[PDB]
Amino acid sequence: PLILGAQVSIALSTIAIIFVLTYFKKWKWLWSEWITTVDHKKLGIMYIISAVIMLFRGGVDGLMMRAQLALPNNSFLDSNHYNEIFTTHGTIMIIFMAMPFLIGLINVVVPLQIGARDVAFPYLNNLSFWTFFVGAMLFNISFVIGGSPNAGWTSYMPLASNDMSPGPGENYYLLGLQIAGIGTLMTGINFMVTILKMRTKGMTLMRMPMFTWTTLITMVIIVFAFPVLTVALALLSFDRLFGAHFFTLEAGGMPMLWANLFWIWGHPEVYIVILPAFGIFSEIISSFARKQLFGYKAMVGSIIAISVLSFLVWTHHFFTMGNSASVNSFFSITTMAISIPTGVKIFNWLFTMYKGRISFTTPMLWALAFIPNFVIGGVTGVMLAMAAADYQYHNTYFLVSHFHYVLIAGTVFACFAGFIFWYPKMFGHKLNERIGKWFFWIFMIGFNICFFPQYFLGLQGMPRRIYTYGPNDGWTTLNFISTVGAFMMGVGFLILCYNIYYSGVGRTLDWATSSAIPPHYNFAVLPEVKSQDAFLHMKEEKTELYPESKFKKIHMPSNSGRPFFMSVAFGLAGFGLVFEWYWMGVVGLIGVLLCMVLRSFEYDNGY
Amino acid sequence: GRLNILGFWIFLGAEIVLFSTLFATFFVLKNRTAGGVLPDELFEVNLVMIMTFLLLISSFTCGIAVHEMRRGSLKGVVIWTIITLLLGAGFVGCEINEFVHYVHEGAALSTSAFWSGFFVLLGTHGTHVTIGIFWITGILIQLKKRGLTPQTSSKIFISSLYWHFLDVVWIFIFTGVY
Amino acid sequence: XXXXXXXXXXXXXXXXXXXXXXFGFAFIQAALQLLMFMHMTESENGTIQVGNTLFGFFGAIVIVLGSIWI
Amino acid sequence: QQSDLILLSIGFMLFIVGVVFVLFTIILVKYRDRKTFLEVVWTVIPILIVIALSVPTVQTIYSLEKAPEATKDKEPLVVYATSVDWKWVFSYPEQDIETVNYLNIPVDRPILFKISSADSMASLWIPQLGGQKYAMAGMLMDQYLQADKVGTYEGRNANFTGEHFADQEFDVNAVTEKDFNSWVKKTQPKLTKEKYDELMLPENVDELTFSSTHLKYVDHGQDAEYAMEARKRLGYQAVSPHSKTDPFENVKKNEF
Numbered sequence A: 001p002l003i004l005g006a007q008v009s010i011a012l013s014t015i016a017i018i019f020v021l022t023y024f025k026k027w028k029w030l031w032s033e034w035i036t037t038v039d040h041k042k043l044g045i046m047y048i049i050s051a052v053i054m055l056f057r058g059g060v061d062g063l064m065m066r067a068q069l070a071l072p073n074n075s076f077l078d079s080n081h082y083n084e085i086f087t088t089h090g091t092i093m094i095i096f097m098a099m100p101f102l103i104g105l106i107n108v109v110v111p112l113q114i115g116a117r118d119v120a121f122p123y124l125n126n127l128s129f130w131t132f133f134v135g136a137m138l139f140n141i142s143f144v145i146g147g148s149p150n151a152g153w154t155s156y157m158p159l160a161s162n163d164m165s166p167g168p169g170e171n172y173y174l175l176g177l178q179i180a181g182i183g184t185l186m187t188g189i190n191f192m193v194t195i196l197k198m199r200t201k202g203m204t205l206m207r208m209p210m211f212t213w214t215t216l217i218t219m220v221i222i223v224f225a226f227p228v229l230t231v232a233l234a235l236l237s238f239d240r241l242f243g244a245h246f247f248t249l250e251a252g253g254m255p256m257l258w259a260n261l262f263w264i265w266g267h268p269e270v271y272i273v274i275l276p277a278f279g280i281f282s283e284i285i286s287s288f289a290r291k292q293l294f295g296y297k298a299m300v301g302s303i304i305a306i307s308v309l310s311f312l313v314w315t316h317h318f319f320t321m322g323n324s325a326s327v328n329s330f331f332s333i334t335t336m337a338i339s340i341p342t343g344v345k346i347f348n349w350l351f352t353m354y355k356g357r358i359s360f361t362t363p364m365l366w367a368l369a370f371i372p373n374f375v376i377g378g379v380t381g382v383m384l385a386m387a388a389a390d391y392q393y394h395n396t397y398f399l400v401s402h403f404h405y406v407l408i409a410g411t412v413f414a415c416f417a418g419f420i421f422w423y424p425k426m427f428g429h430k431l432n433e434r435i436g437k438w439f440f441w442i443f444m445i446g447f448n449i450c451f452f453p454q455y456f457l458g459l460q461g462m463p464r465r466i467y468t469y470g471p472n473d474g475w476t477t478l479n480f481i482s483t484v485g486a487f488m489m490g491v492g493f494l495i496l497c498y499n500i501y502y503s504g505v506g507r508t509l510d511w512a513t514s515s516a517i518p519p520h521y522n523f524a525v526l527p528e529v530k531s532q533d534a535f536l537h538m539k540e541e542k543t544e545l546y547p548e549s550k551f552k553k554i555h556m557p558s559n560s561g562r563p564f565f566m567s568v569a570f571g572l573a574g575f576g577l578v579f580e581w582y583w584m585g586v587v588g589l590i591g592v593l594l595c596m597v598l599r600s601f602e603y604d605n606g607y
Numbered sequence B: 001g002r003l004n005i006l007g008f009w010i011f012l013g014a015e016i017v018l019f020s021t022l023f024a025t026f027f028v029l030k031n032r033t034a035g036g037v038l039p040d041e042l043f044e045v046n047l048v049m050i051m052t053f054l055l056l057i058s059s060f061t062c063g064i065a066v067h068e069m070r071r072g073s074l075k076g077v078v079i080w081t082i083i084t085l086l087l088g089a090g091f092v093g094c095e096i097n098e099f100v101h102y103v104h105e106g107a108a109l110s111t112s113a114f115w116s117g118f119f120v121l122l123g124t125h126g127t128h129v130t131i132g133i134f135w136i137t138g139i140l141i142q143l144k145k146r147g148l149t150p151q152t153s154s155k156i157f158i159s160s161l162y163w164h165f166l167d168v169v170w171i172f173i174f175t176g177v178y
Numbered sequence C: 001x002x003x004x005x006x007x008x009x010x011x012x013x014x015x016x017x018x019x020x021x022x023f024g025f026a027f028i029q030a031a032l033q034l035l036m037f038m039h040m041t042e043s044e045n046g047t048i049q050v051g052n053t054l055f056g057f058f059g060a061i062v063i064v065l066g067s068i069w070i
Numbered sequence D: 001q002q003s004d005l006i007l008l009s010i011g012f013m014l015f016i017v018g019v020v021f022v023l024f025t026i027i028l029v030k031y032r033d034r035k036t037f038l039e040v041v042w043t044v045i046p047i048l049i050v051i052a053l054s055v056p057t058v059q060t061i062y063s064l065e066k067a068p069e070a071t072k073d074k075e076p077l078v079v080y081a082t083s084v085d086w087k088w089v090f091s092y093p094e095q096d097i098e099t100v101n102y103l104n105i106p107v108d109r110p111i112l113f114k115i116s117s118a119d120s121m122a123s124l125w126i127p128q129l130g131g132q133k134y135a136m137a138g139m140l141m142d143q144y145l146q147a148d149k150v151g152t153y154e155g156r157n158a159n160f161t162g163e164h165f166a167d168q169e170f171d172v173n174a175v176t177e178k179d180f181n182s183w184v185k186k187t188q189p190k191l192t193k194e195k196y197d198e199l200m201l202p203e204n205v206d207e208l209t210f211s212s213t214h215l216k217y218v219d220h221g222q223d224a225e226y227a228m229e230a231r232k233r234l235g236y237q238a239v240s241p242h243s244k245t246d247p248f249e250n251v252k253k254n255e256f
């Protein structure tokens, strides 16, 4: 309680700082060219700068957690205000960090590589940001205004309603993700239509090239694995608020049914956080290598396998609860059938880097380090797929050690790779290469001495979600080593922000823009392409530019202030149902009232 | 040419998983009510609800084909789209008095775990058909200062085909829950 | 004119559905929607349009027959 | 420790995969600085890596079902295992006995652990016995175990965290046959009826012997609604800030 009193003042200070320094006059720059803007380039920016903000929020969280877990009998954090702490850390990632960080790198890089103007509905994509953001402030305001949930990012049902007890805990998780799920659902719908009907002439479907293909796969899984989340929480939101008994222990409802609904959405979304990560790494390793992605009838054909085989594998997170054995081997054999379509994509990055040249720049290093660390986590998930041995290392850190290798090397590195390799798109010049190398090395070495002792921590006998281990066979140092490496990755986020204080060998339509920071209309003429890689065939082979006297008109999808007002209603009704208001919501119905009024304005505005 | 016909179409594919999630929820919560009321609902109301909706699409499969596509019955839009709008209230009015009559033993979602799924598998079900009325009437404000021609006023078609998607699970609810 | 033939054929499936109660009955439900939606998909934007809805019912079988599978 | 041979044998299987990719990068790359038929022929090995596990792993999933690490279809001992919050409950239907946060089993004997819970989902891990099974509040899950050598087997929970869940460590032991029957005889407190309800509060407890079985109470494996008749009959529902301490109304057996 003592710690949470300083940040509410710091939270009010930051709010008080925006008024004096920034709000001298903002209804001409903040409300016009931003907030409710339509240009796809500006939206993708607002996605990742929230993920960096959540990185520090997730950062002080991840650090003080392991700082508490330095050694046994440590009195930094108590039983609770750790459960809430470690729950906020995990939900801030994936949902409010890796999702906005990935879609942001998608909401920017994909529409330029296809030659189109904006996206399909540059109007519905506007609210698609705020729909996530009001869910971010909802889940962030659980800080001191209410109480952050303390059931994990999973938050199973039997420990979530009355057995749990905190009122304003799970509701932020239910209503916070319920909104962002609506926003994230529309981001998959916009980009599923943008990459199918707005491509430029000559841009053939089979070659466009491969990252824009992974994004296509990313925005397909979102469409079919988010309506589940929309009802899985809505069912849970009915259990919590309106008094439903879908999974309640009392009226006899199935406590495990909410587990299977969450995971029917769970593991498919797990690939939504790794699909764009694969794509962002597919260009960079074939761009500064100056070679051809050798393999398409077996690499893009491999990107479709994991897209469907993600829903025949989701039952691998259970196993321990004693299923029908046969059904515990079905998804066990099937899970091994998911590490093979994922496996061939690693053999496709090394033979596109061989025979070809290379220059170790900063974005190369992130692609250099992505190859091993993701496999070291992948050579452990194969073990997790074995249901017969999953019962021994279920939970117990060895699971935590598996996936932290999979996602941080997978997505967090791709979030860092897409950060630097496509930074000249965002503003002038780029990051300093030599001192940017200092951030790469320190963040990489602390990553392993943090989670590889967890492979020994978990196998020796340290379960997960535990605030004190105890002197068990001298297994204290493996825990402290994990914390040293944990606090070591923190050292670096200061460097990451210092590199920001300073304020190429392309092979696709990246540097093909008229100059740095491409304009609003993006590309005056649509490229003919008619080949696999556009930039190299449009540099050495001929020239081909944007000749004058061949221009035409504008797009004119101007701004409308409704998406901001639309999501505030979602954030207002969401906050109103969470913070007290147990049975029914006095203001929760108004948010429903305001949203439907704007949905009439949706089809009452001619443009 | 408007791609919203395709964009708000892949949104209709997402709701298949929405209702399938509720169908998986409901089909697992079928054998409960270990302590509560056993389900016994009126049979004639089911066919009356289903036949009202099966006749709702019968006035809508031809409500745009022999309307805008075949010939040009521009005056019939206040005829075919209004009659099909009153049939939407028939399902709403019948399902509301069905829930109010269920206040008599088995009210809302608190009586049993089974009635929680049914009041939600048919709950957001009833919500989807209620907002469609306001969406079908939302386009009916176009024959005033607008009055667009076919192949241009896509609001009718994109809202007509959304309205069609209901009867899909509506029939799957007929077989699913009954 | 041509759409009335399917609409007239659709009403009999519900009447035969009541005759089943008052696989063999899990198919008449899917077949009732085939004729209903086959009058508004292809083409132009088709192939993609009628293709989007195909893999959604797979999840319905995977989600339903998969949840019941436990 | 039956599946431990998979862990050690599989450990080297991926230890090779980690070094295979060391030969695929370090051997070149340095030599290569400025200063279609292979992919199709590659599809023969990846199933060979997984089908060599998609048979012995499936030959093990069906192996933990029937009577495993014990003997044959004899000596059937039943032990009803219940999981309240933080605290572990185990009751023997053979003779009127029931222990809490402690468990004794004779070595080289089959034990049909009936796994269940009271208020929150759980699972008896016990890192020396091997596999764990979730304690599902609402039904009983069967699970058989045994004892390798005589020793001290640590035991914990799946730790579905809930304030008092990290200290769910309950110690279990495995001794001989002759000492088990003398130990069982010495015991016969009893099933004090009300002290059972004095257990569903999540706190901290000591040994609590109890020489009478509690399964005469709604089975507990069935009708998991015993969370309302538990915490609420003594007047207690916790919160997150202030006014906890089990909202007044005393009577219990705590620490110190």
Ligand code: HEA
Pocket: A055, A056, A058, A059, A060, A062, A063, A065, A066, A086, A087, A088, A089, A090, A091, A093, A094, A098, A151, A152, A153, A154, A397, A400, A404, A407, A408, A411, A412, A450, A463, A464, A465, A466, A482, A485, A486, A487, A489, A490, A491, A492, A493, A494
């Ligand atoms: C995107 C995925 C992702 C990312 C990036 C991270 C980031 C980190 N995580 Fe975690 N983690 C999860 C995924 C992730 N995590 C998940 C899914 C859970 C479980 C969720 C749940 O079930 O509740 C979890 C919880 C979890 C656990 C397991 C908890 C347990 O079992 O008891 C551990 C183990 O130590 C951990 C450690 C770290 C560390 C050291 C980082 C580092 O990357 C830290 C990153 C920090 C920065 C980049 C900024 C550093 C901050 C500073 C420099 C500020 C310092 C200033 C002051 C202290 C004043 N986090």
Ligand code: HEA
Pocket: A154, A270, A271, A273, A274, A316, A317, A318, A319, A335, A336, A338, A339, A340, A342, A343, A344, A346, A375, A378, A379, A380, A381, A382, A384, A385, A386, A390, A394, A395, A399, A402, A403, A406, A407, A410, D017, D046, D049, D050
């Ligand atoms: C980016 C997200 C992501 C990705 C891509 C993966 C990828 C994989 N994961 Fe995992 N996983 C998670 C996110 C992810 N996972 C999360 C978040 C959890 C914990 C959730 C929670 O409980 O909170 C988890 C936990 C988890 C479980 C559940 C454990 C439990 O029951 O508690 C399982 C079970 O099968 C698993 C296995 C796998 C496998 C086999 C792959 C495969 O796709 C990996 C493919 C890679 C390889 C197979 C190695 C590379 C291949 C080669 C080098 C070719 C040669 C190799 C062979 C021939 C084997 N991981």
Ligand SMILES: [Cu+2]
Pocket: A266, A267, A270, A313, A314, A316, A317
């Ligand atoms: Cu998974």
